[PDB]
């Protein structure tokens, strides 16, 4: 079954962080995690245009 692919966000490099502008056409799942010993993750369903740090 065919599925779409979300358009790439806008990435803004900061000091030990980034900021993303997410523009969804419909509810889209967004998650992240750090690649260390204590992962520090998060998941969230995104329904409108938001900015995430």
């Amino acid at each position: 079954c065919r599925v779409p692919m979300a358009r790439e966000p806008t990435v803004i490099h900061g000091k030990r962080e980034v900021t993303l502008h997410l523009h969804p056409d419909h509810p889209t799942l967004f998650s992240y995690r750090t690649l260390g010993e204590d992962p520090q993750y998060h998941e969230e369903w995104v329904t409108a245009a938001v900015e995430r740090t």
Partner: protein
């Protein structure tokens, strides 16, 4: 999507005969995006249907 299901036919006297039940039916597609209609450009993921054989 809806809150009930109704099926009906048209008998020999041309009178409508219907049955109505309570069904939930909120479906979601596969993947990480809650689209509604397949695009012309996208990905492919395994899906399960009811084959018409």
């Amino acid at each position: 999507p809806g809150e009930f299901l109704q099926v009906s036919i048209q008998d020999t006297r041309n009178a409508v005969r219907a049955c109505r039940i309570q069904y939930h039916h909120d479906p979601q597609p596969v993947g990480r995006e809650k689209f509604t209609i397949r695009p012309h450009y996208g990905k492919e993921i395994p899906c399960t249907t009811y084959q018409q054989t």
